[PDB]
Amino acid sequence: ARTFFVGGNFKLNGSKQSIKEIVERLNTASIPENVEVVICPPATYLDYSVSLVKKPQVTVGAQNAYLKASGAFTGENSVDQIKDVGAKYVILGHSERRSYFHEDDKFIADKTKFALGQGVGVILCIGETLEEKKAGKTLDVVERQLNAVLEEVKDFTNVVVAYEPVWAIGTGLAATPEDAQDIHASIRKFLASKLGDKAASELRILYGGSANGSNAVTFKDKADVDGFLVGGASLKPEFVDIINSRN
Amino acid sequence: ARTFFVGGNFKLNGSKQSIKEIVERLNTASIPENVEVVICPPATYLDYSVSLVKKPQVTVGAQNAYLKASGAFTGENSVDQIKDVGAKYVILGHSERRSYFHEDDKFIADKTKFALGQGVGVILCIGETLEEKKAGKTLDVVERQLNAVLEEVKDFTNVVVAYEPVWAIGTGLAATPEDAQDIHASIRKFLASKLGDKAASELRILYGGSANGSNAVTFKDKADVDGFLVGGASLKPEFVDIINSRN
């Protein structure tokens, strides 16, 4: 079926020393056979992180990139450069980019198409705000965000979707496992209509937003929740407890 | 005296191999002792670049960073992390960030203050568009851009200013040495009124915008032009000719 996937988004955090400690912990940890773990450090530490990983279940991703591989884009990251240093994924559409950096739905779509065509997988983030949720707009919002991508991207084989309610990011206010499950089940049926039944059944749809070592186990029996995108807890020992939460 | 300064802004260009070739060419180049050369690769290559330098004249800079050192800012660079890997500068306010990425004058000011307080130097970019030049607004624009920074930043000891007319960036259409000289002198005079005579006398003011190995030598006798911020030519062997242009 679907291989359980745990992404660690370090965000703007880390030093050479602290990232070494996170990666050695993973190298020495009990990790199941059938799990995919992707750690996403700042771009400054991508090469170094790859160089430290020894565990086959662990790969490295970037936190953002531009929609061209080269050119006059001072300060951007490139998917070709991410690939050059051995990383395998990029996070696109994170709420912090859509909000604070005003990245619109088409910008995210164009970046996703570009990354996939360069042979780099995408952790595609979607999610609604608190106001949007209270007004009944959750599914309309995430379907709008996905539709923009689907106009440009016809094959999600090297995509993982992360559903992260904005109001749950960093706040300690996570969605309930039942509410997450219901939203993920709706997203998957929507995508079956766009990508086909097989692709929908293969696609990992992650929960993120205050996922931690204590609540991850509460999602264990939610069939349409295929893993997590973990922010703050990815810096901490309990990241390993999340990885093992389906034991 | 003001030490001649040559910055190389690689923009969104490079690979581990092609950056190694750039740095090794600098390492073995015949260059004067009293020059300051700062190469600015993509964030993905900062640590690697620092590790390869074997030339006292050469240090490394980043192309952009955020106004905080850590936190929930997916996809940003941090001045603390740039410093951690051995880099000494950050480019702030590049036209490609101000224009395409809508980085406002206040955002640049706040980043510049932050970087300097973390012990990282700043290559501060300013410049007018074609329409602004035609309208008679060149000095009004660069004084507005500088004034925003000066509200937050009271000491330019670890600053280098890069004057880059936007219409000259990447186009082949450089300012003339006479015109650059007159603008640089006007900027220095303005800044003496704000920062004092000592500071204005010590500040490097660079020209950028289609600075290349043929035209750099034509600026050799312009007293207020202290060096160059080089984009496209920083990827090429002629970068060394620019460093040697005052021989």
Swiss-Prot record, chains A, B:
Record-linked InterPro entries: Aldolase_TIM, TIM_sf, TrioseP_Isoase_bac/euk, Triosephosphate_isomerase, Triosephosphate_isomerase_AS
PANTHER family: TRIOSEPHOSPHATE ISOMERASE
Record's protein name: Triosephosphate isomerase
Covalent link location (Glycyl lysine isopeptide (Lys-Gly) (interchain with G-Cter in ubiquitin)): K222
Pfam families assigned: TIM
Matching NCBIfam families: tim
EC number: 5.3.1.1
Amino-acid positions noted as binding substrate in the UniProt annotation, renumbered to this chain: N9, K11
Record text on subunit structure and interactions: Homodimer.
GO-annotated cellular components: cytoplasm; cytosol; mitochondrion; plasma membrane
Taxonomic lineage of the native organism: Eukaryota, Fungi, Dikarya, Ascomycota, Saccharomycotina
Active site: H94 (electrophile), E164 (proton acceptor)
Gene assigned in the entry: TPI1
Pathway in which this enzyme or protein is active: Carbohydrate biosynthesis; gluconeogenesis; Carbohydrate degradation; glycolysis; D-glyceraldehyde 3-phosphate from glycerone phosphate: step 1/1
Phosphoserine PTM positions: S70, S214
Signal sequence interval, chain numbering: none
Record's catalysed reaction(s): D-glyceraldehyde 3-phosphate = dihydroxyacetone phosphate
Modified residues (Phosphothreonine): T3
Keywords: Gluconeogenesis, Glycolysis, Isomerase, Isopeptide bond, Phosphoprotein, Ubl conjugation
Top-level taxon of origin: Eukaryota
One of the GO BP terms on file: glycolytic process
Family membership: Belongs to the triosephosphate isomerase family.
Molecular function GO labels: triose-phosphate isomerase activity
